[PDB]
Amino acid sequence: SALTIFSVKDPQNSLWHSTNAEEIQQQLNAKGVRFERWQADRDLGAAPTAETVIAAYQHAIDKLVAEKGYQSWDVISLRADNPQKEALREKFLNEHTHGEDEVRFFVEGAGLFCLHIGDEVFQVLCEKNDLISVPAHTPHWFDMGSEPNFTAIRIF
Numbered sequence: 628s629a630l631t632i633f634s635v636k637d638p639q640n641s642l643w644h645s646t647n648a649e650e651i652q653q654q655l656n657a658k659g660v661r662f663e664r665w666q667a668d669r670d671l672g673a674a675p676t677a678e679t680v681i682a683a684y685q686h687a688i689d690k691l692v693a694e695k696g697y698q699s700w701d702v703i704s705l706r707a708d709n710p711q712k713e714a715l716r717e718k719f720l721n722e723h724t725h726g727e728d729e730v731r732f733f734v735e736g737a738g739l740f741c742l743h744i745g746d747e748v749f750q751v752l753c754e755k756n757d758l759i760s761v762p763a764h765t766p767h768w769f770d771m772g773s774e775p776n777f778t779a780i781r782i783f
């Protein structure tokens with residue numbers, strides 16, 4: 628719901644910062660990044676799992692991006708009753724990239740998605756409200772800082 632882009636020399640001095648539908652889309656698409664707003668009106672119950680959240684927003688993946696054979700979709704949820712929430716930070720906080728642009732849609736929970744393109748650091752908040760998809764060759768990392776639960780959908 629927000630986009631920030633400053634020079635690599637000004638990391639704390641967020642120079643350009645704005646949060647608008649056309650504004651976030653113009654900045655994202657202007658860099659070859661797709662962006663859309665999805666409606667999370669599908670209820671999977673109180674706790675959202677990967678298999679269910681998968682079958683429900685499954686029909687939404689068909690309109691997301693039609694290309695290649697799309698191997699499959701997966702979900703990344705963190706539970707507080709699983710000691711793997713602490714080690715999972717170094718596990719998702721490292722740089723991981725693929726040679727194909729993947730898309731991620733959050734249906735339950737919010738995560739801070741940071742993008743790195745050239746000498747600029749992008750800071751955009753992600754919520755189960757809309758959707759975000761970055762290009763291949765572009766590294767992305769999730770912001771943990773804590774052990775909160777968040778449901779995400781990966782398609783590539």
Ligand SMILES: [Fe+2]
Pocket residue numbers: 723724725729767
């Ligand atoms: Fe990825």
